């Protein structure tokens, strides 16, 4: 609104400091950037997700292994006493 | 990011792998275990 001697530019600045609008290839780079970093984001959470789950599944089978172990130690045991 | 991504998927593909390895040698460990009782 202001009568400064440079306007345009100063403007222009501000509306970078601040990212608002209100120019074409400063809206596409603000675009491209935020959808860059909501993928990676989401990828990051994805991947993230994805080993936790992962770590769980190899506990149960791990339980699982260590069940079918017991199980092979108790018969060889029955059949040695036997 | 993307050797952090990739290493976090590989983590999750060993993790998975090896529960179904796990798996499988539980199995094993059942078969054998009813061939000796047997």
Not at 11 to 21: E, H, L, P, S, T
Not at 48 to 62: H, P, R, T, V
């Amino acid at each position: 609104s202001t009568d400064l001697p440079n306007r345009d530019e100063i403007v222009k600045r501000i509306r970078q400091i601040n990212g608002m609008r209100d120019p074409t290839p400063e809206e596409l780079q603000q675009q491209q950037a935020a959808a860059e970093q909501a993928q990676a984001q989401k990828a990051m959470f994805m991947a993230e997700l994805s080993e936790k789950q992962g770590k769980a599944d190899k506990a149960q089978a791990d339980a699982v292994a260590a069940q079918a172990n017991a199980d092979l130690r108790a018969a060889q045991a029955e059949q040695v006493r036997r």
